[PDB]
Amino acid sequence: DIIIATKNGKVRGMQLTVFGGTVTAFLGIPYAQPPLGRLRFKKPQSLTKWSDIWNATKYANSCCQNIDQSFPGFHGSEMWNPNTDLSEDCLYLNVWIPAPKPKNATVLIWIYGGGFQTGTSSLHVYDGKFLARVERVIVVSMNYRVGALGFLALPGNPEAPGNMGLFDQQLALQWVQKNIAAFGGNPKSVTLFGESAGAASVSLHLLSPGSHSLFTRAILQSGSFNAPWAVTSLYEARNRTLNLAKLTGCSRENETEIIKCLRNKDPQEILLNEAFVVPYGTPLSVNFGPTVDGDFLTDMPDILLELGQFKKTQILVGVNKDEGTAFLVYGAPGFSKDNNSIITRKEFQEGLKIFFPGVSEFGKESILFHYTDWVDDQRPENYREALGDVVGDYNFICPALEFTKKFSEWGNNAFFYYFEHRSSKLPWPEWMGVMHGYEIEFVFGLPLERRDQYTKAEEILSRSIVKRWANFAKYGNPQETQNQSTSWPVFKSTEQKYLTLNTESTRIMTKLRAQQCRFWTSFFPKV
Ligand SMILES: *[C@@H]1O[C@H](CO[C@@H]2O[C@@H](C)[C@@H](O)[C@@H](O)[C@@H]2O)[C@@H](O[C@@H]2O[C@H](CO)[C@@H](O)[C@H](O)[C@H]2NC(C)=O)[C@H](O)[C@H]1NC(C)=O
Ligand SMILES: *[C@@H]1O[C@H](CO[C@@H]2O[C@@H](C)[C@@H](O)[C@@H](O)[C@@H]2O)[C@@H](O[C@@H]2O[C@H](CO)[C@@H](O)[C@H](O)[C@H]2NC(C)=O)[C@H](O)[C@H]1NC(C)=O
Ligand SMILES: CN(C)CCNC(=O)c1cc2c(cnn2CC2CCCCC2)cc1Cc1ccc(F)cc1F
Ligand SMILES: *[C@@H]1O[C@H](CO[C@@H]2O[C@@H](C)[C@@H](O)[C@@H](O)[C@@H]2O)[C@@H](O)[C@H](O)[C@H]1NC(C)=O
Ligand SMILES: *[C@@H]1O[C@H](CO[C@@H]2O[C@@H](C)[C@@H](O)[C@@H](O)[C@@H]2O)[C@@H](O)[C@H](O)[C@H]1NC(C)=O
Ligand SMILES: *[C@@H]1O[C@H](CO)[C@@H](O)[C@H](O)[C@H]1NC(C)=O
Ligand SMILES: *[C@@H]1O[C@H](CO)[C@@H](O)[C@H](O)[C@H]1NC(C)=O
Numbered sequence: 001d002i003i004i005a006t007k008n009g010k011v012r013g014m015q016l017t018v019f020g021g022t023v024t025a026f027l028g029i030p031y032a033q034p035p036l037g038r039l040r041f042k043k044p045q046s047l048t049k050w051s052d053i054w055n056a057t058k059y060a061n062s063c064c065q066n067i068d069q070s071f072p073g074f075h076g077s078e079m080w081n082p083n084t085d086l087s088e089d090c091l092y093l094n095v096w097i098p099a100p101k102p103k104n105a106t107v108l109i110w111i112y113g114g115g116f117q118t119g120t121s122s123l124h125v126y127d128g129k130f131l132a133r134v135e136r137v138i139v140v141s142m143n144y145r146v147g148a149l150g151f152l153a154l155p156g157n158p159e160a161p162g163n164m165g166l167f168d169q170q171l172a173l174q175w176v177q178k179n180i181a182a183f184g185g186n187p188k189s190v191t192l193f194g195e196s197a198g199a200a201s202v203s204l205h206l207l208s209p210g211s212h213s214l215f216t217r218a219i220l221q222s223g224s225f226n227a228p229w230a231v232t233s234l235y236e237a238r239n240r241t242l243n244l245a246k247l248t249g250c251s252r253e254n255e256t257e258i259i260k261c262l263r264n265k266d267p268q269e270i271l272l273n274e275a276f277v278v279p280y281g282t283p284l285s286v287n288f289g290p291t292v293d294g295d296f297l298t299d300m301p302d303i304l305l306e307l308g309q310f311k312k313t314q315i316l317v318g319v320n321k322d323e324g325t326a327f328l329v330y331g332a333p334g335f336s337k338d339n340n341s342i343i344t345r346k347e348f349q350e351g352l353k354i355f356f357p358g359v360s361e362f363g364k365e366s367i368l369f370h371y372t373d374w375v376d377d378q379r380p381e382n383y384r385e386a387l388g389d390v391v392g393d394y395n396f397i398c399p400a401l402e403f404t405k406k407f408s409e410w411g412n413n414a415f416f417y418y419f420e421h422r423s424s425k426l427p428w429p430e431w432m433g434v435m436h437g438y439e440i441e442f443v444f445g446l447p448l449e450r451r452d453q454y455t456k457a458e459e460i461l462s463r464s465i466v467k468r469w470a471n472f473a474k475y476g477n478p479q480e481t482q483n484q485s486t487s488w489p490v491f492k493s494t495e496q497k498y499l500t501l502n503t504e505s506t507r508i509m510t511k512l513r514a515q516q517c518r519f520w521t522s523f524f525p526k527v
Pocket of ligand 6: 254255256257
């Protein structure tokens with residue numbers, strides 16, 4: 001029996017057998033007043049103590065959110081949908097400490113992704129019990145608000161200021177500062193890590209001053225704030241807020257009266273109208289996301305980055321080979337998870353209209369120009385592979401590289417990886433490759449479980465990734481010093497070296513997607 005006393009009360013953990021060892025899990029610790037009733041849309045209010053022993057023995061409610069209904073029954077897409085009840089009462093976090101209780105352990109804090117509209121910390125692929133067991137780090141994850149309930153913004157108006165989901169996270173980071181010492185964790189050695197919108201959330205904590213003192217280092221997996229889907233403009237955020245007010249009858253004229261009106265609508269009514277607040281939509285459409293609120297973010301983050309105004313520390317940043325493929329079966333004509341999705345120039349051109357709806361005819365032509373100079377015109381998958389690369393280079397790879405370039409320029413160590421291993425278990429078709437989101441199980445040491453059908457080569461690759469991530473977290477340097485591993489160079493805006501992760505040879509390469517990213521980063525922004 002194990003009971004930790006937090007500043008707000010006592011909490012009872014539970015015991016987990018992992019790899020002939022024992023990990024203690026604390027699942028579902030409240031970290032704020034439930035944002036219910038008059039607290040909907042407002043910032044997370046601090047929590048009143050409890051006298052009891054909170055039985056943090058089961059994952060808490062996931063936050064309200066629309067569910068991806070594109071592949072019922074299919075574990076490839078369903079493994080990402082929430083696996084506890086949805087509920088506005090969802091501000092909870094989890095703690096995996098190694099047993100025997102550590103003394104002064106590095107803390108890893110996981111922020112999930114999901115387009116800022118979806119996600120939950122209780123996913124099987126976010127299970128921190130492995131990392132605690134193998135590397136004796138403490139893993140913490142939290143649920144934060146998503147969609148309108150977590151990112152609605154009427155600027156200046158505390159009734160709905162924006163970035164509430166980000167403030168949810170930041171209140172969790174602070175819970176860890178005030179409480180993790182009781183769990184055997186060193187609040188002075190905290191590494192934020194996250195994926196996709198999680199990764200972009202991590203970058204926004206580097207920029208936000210109120211986060212400066214809540215963490216030590218940062219890890220950005222397939223995502224950063226300068227990604228085109230990541231920050232909403234103050235204009236759009238109001239249009240999207242008001243358009244939502246029409247669709248729900250809640251359109252008033254006193255702004256606060258509008259918010260008053262939405263607080264009395266049902267979570268399902270708000271959930272069901274979010275989709276239409278944009279006039280056109282793409283599969284990469286963050287309807288309600290981060291904005292420049294003058295509280296969490298003081299200015300347009302693209303400026304803060306450019307002018308060095310961020311927490312000075314080490315970052316580890318990477319992306320997956322085929323970031324873009326998953327999105328093609330959510331709309332692109334001629335694509336399917338269930339055939340080889342060979343497509344034509346005309347199908348290719350039509351999918352550009354799908355993925356860049358507001359872009360001029362010449363913008364769409366320029367994308368076709370820079371991705372169809374076929375080295376070999378014979379290949380039939382030319383246009384299929386091109387579109388995946390379009391979406392992946394524009395939405396994920398290039399913004400990650402540009403962020404690492406820019407952030408390293410102010411003198412901090414940065415390490416870049418390129419994950420190129422396709423899971424031996426992966427349930428999606430082969431034309432999709434190394435998909436967005438499918439390094440996460442390797443980062444969390446799930447292949448370390450030999451009773452899971454992963455190959456032995458995958459066991460090692462996970463084992464090495466878990467070592468590298470932990471060393472980065474403890475000592476700001478992501479090396480695997482013992483097993484004669486390939487050393488991981490720092491990323492310098494000059495030479496731009498990165499590490500490839502794979503089951504065969506881990507190599508050191510240079511200037512990833514240089515041709516493609518000069519286009520996306522210098523030309524295309526101007527069209
Ligand atoms: C700001 O919002 C208006 C309104 O959008 C319409 O109403 C919403 C509730 C939602 O259902 C949208 O799809 C609606 O279109 C936008 O103006 C609309 O623009 C679209 C573009 O296709 C047009 O078809 C509609 O008829 C327009 N309706 C009105 C009332 O103007 C406007 O474009 C939005 N601004 C931005 C920057 O997105
Ligand atoms: C690949 O499949 C797509 C998707 O269509 C569905 O999936 C198939 C596996 C099969 O069950 C189809 O009958 C399904 O409808 C096909 O795209 C369709 O293509 C036809 C003709 O090309 C067109 O009328 C439809 O509008 C398309 N629908 C969608 C949703 O894209 C595509 O033709 C298949 N291509 C190859 C090369 O196999
Ligand atoms: C990385 N994790 C975050 C993976 C989780 N799902 C997605 O990221 C995703 C979601 C998508 C789309 C297009 N529309 N929606 C709708 C969402 C958002 C709003 C309400 C309905 C649900 C595309 C993708 C990309 C995607 C899908 C499956 C997958 F295996 C890996 C992936 F990369
Ligand atoms: C919280 O849990 C208390 C003790 O839990 C029970 O006993 C221990 C030894 C374990 O076996 C555990 O799995 C058992 O459930 C309960 O006595 C107490 O009522 C619980 N409080 C709640 C659920 O509010
Ligand atoms: C815990 O340790 C604190 C300082 O050490 C920290 O850990 C190492 C790994 C580095 O990241 C370093 O920067 C950190 O400062 C002490 O101040 C603290 O009192 C220690 N507490 C206990 C209970 O051991
Ligand atoms: C809007 O309504 C609120 C709630 O009564 C009120 O306090 C606020 O001052 C109003 N503002 C205007 C401009 O009418
Ligand atoms: C190093 O190699 C041994 C086998 O010689 C393996 O059991 C161990 O876990 C490895 N550690 C890593 C890759 O971090």
